[PDB]
Amino acid sequence: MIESPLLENLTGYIGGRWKDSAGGATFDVYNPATGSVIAKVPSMPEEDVVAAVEAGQSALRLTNPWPIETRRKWLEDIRDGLKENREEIGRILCMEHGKPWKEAQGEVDYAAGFFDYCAKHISALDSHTIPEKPKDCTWTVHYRPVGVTGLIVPWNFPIGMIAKKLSAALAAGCPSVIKPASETPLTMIAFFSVMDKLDLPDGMVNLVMGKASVIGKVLCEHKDVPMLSFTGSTEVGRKLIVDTAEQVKKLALELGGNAPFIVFDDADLEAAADNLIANKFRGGGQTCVCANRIFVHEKVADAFGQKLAERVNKMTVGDGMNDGIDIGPLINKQGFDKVKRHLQDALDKGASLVAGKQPAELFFPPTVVQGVDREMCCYQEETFGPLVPMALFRTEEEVIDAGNDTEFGLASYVFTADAERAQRVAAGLRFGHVGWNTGTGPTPEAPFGGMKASGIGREGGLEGLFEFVEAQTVPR
Template identity: 60%
Template sequence: MIESYLLKNLAGYIDGQWVGADSGETIEVLNPANGKTLAEIPKMGTDETTRAIAAANAALPSVPDVETRREWLEDTRDALLDEKEEIGRILCLEHGKPWKEAQGEVEYAASFFDYYAKSMEAALAPEELADKAKGCTWTVHKRSIGVAGLITPWNFPIGMIAKKIAPALAAGCPVVIKPATETPLTMIAMFQLMHERLELPKGMINLVMGSSSQIGGELMSSPDVPMISFTGSTGVGQLLIDQSKDNVKKLGLELGGNAPFIVLDDADLDAAAENLIANKFRGGGQTCVCANRIFVQKGVYKEFSEKVVDKVKALKVGDGMDDDVDVGPLINKAGFDKVHDHVKDALSKGAKLVAGKHPDELDSDKNLFYTPTVITDVTHDMKCCTDETFGPLVPMIEFDTDEEAVTLGNRTEFGLAAYVFGKDAKRAHKIIGQLHFGHCGYNTGTGPAAHAPFGGMLQSGIGREGGHDGLLEYVELQTVPDGS
């Protein structure tokens, strides 16, 4: 069992109090590196969520001014940075990603609190329009949308909540948060810090854990929750869209991805290979923005593949708490088996295994460590191209012309992230301009940052997180014509 001074209360948090499940039922949180139980958390449902919504709604009249809210964000930022090693340890143990990488995620989370603390006052200021019409002066106010329901996934246990709760609090929205049951401990640790260090109105922040259908269903059906922000699968996102119609809720959705990573024949191959490794194996490949399909132009395909293979073979796989580990375990058996299935499918259709173990040597019943794998001679009919693998698999696909790269890159219903590498900026940006992805890196594999809007096109989502646009997700615009 895990022990931490940040986990004094393995409980939910409603109306300023730590609470268990009404039923007394619990859910085990497992360490994916060894399968051992880390903790048991309350399995909450409809009734607890109803009370959390009521508490958040009751907090609305007591939401303080911008200056006080800015202090909340600054204090949370400082608390996260002060405790990044311990939060990172908790994150590593429940997720599996290396401890150093987990600490980097805590720093990433803190950057959202920092950004909105610095930018919120100007962003929320009323805007007086320059033009007069109908004998009136016109002013646009940004009003808090009200209670926000925040639903987060397991792959970034603190990064994903930071990009939601920071702008929500900045805008003056009380929140009800549901974390993934695979990784709730990091969230509990953050709530412990906020409970101890911030003077929040009761009900301003609420945490419910447990049944996705019951908690999500209550958040969606309640007229007192006008805004839902969700990060997760496209299938669940589509369900939320359907459920939102009765109350006409505002939705912010970051959904699935199938990112192309395009290497042109004039690219710096060493830099492209380094960026691919950093991008692909972050979180063990379990990120929506990591490269899923690697397209390499014919003239450099062999050379680039060899560079990638050398780097992949050098990666160290193991328990994230061990020194020098690059890649930890996958989150669970289902995640492991999906990667396993994608590799077997590709090999059965003619792909070649050039790095990693043959799938017959790997078994999720033994452990969840999937060896980083590279396959070549991949074609677009293979599962690893049509579906998001979400694991440490690098499928190498050869292409001939720039037009073919665009066509293949866009051959997906998803549009979250893409990457293009090449020295000719005009050529590369022509390709980028034809790719239907909300985030498209040029000569970099970096993901989103706090100061920039991030989100998907097509079936990868609605709305944006980060930047000025991320804050506006939590406000309603009220236009006031003044004829006096």
């Protein structure tokens, strides 16, 4: 059983109060490393969620809005709370997620970064008066809080994800009802424990936990929740669009991906291998930003694969708390099985094994396979595991089409020394994020979001700041 100064209150949080009405109802939180229960978390009822919304609604202030300077201070204080607690918050993340302790701490730093960007740029929501005076009026445009919002996040980034949402929601003056994945609630609870000591207005942030059905239902149907920001499965997200259609709710969605990582025959192979590894095994591959389809030009395919094998073979798998562990365990059995299945499917269909073990011999080790085509499962769906499937290509036009050969359009990466070709590939890829000779993911300073089925809206950057506002135009 886990114990932490950040978790002395193992319960919900409503209107400035740690509380719940589960009546002892509980759900288990496992450590994927030990296969053991590390905490029993209150499984909260419908009524707690409704209580949460009433509290948020009561912190919402339109006629007498919290001032810009007051909000900026919450933002700074949160940035500072995360940084101060990185080690312990990161510890809890490692234990419920699997992710190595060091990487987990870094995610906390990353989270801090989003609060920092919103604090410095919160003025971007300042209302403005256009210079033109049509129909003999003066026209002023305001950005109103959208209202109480539900922030829903997956286990993929137990702390980084909510940071992207909460930072922009607070900047806009929106109270929020927050729901974490039942796989990684503890990092949430810890996070609230830190905020609990920062003098946020009662009901500005609220925490509900438990059965997805119970929480999701209230949040979808409630008339005082004009907006949902959801990150998670495309399946669940599509059900959200349907279930919020009558009220025509405002949605921010970041869903599944199928990131093509493209390496040209004129690529800097060493940089590309280095970037690939950094990109791919972050979170044991369990990311929507992680490369999923590696396209390598025939002329350098063999040398590239060997470069990844040299790198991949020096990596270690195991318990992430221990030191010197590069990748931890996958989140659960269902996730492990899908990765094993993709491995089998590729080999059975005749891909070759460049690095890693045979599925029969299988914690999932870093694995590289070569000779992948559109017929393999791992090409058609996202692996969410430490698997590197290499596909071949020769032409620019071919690889762009193959790149775009998917429902999705979240992240992608292109490596080439021809700057003009790199630029065309970026324009041609129907993805919200394109790495140009880098495999680096989204940053708080810039928009991240998907085209096609990968989502709606952008988080991070200028546009991220506008997620939780409604433009209101006022002629005088």
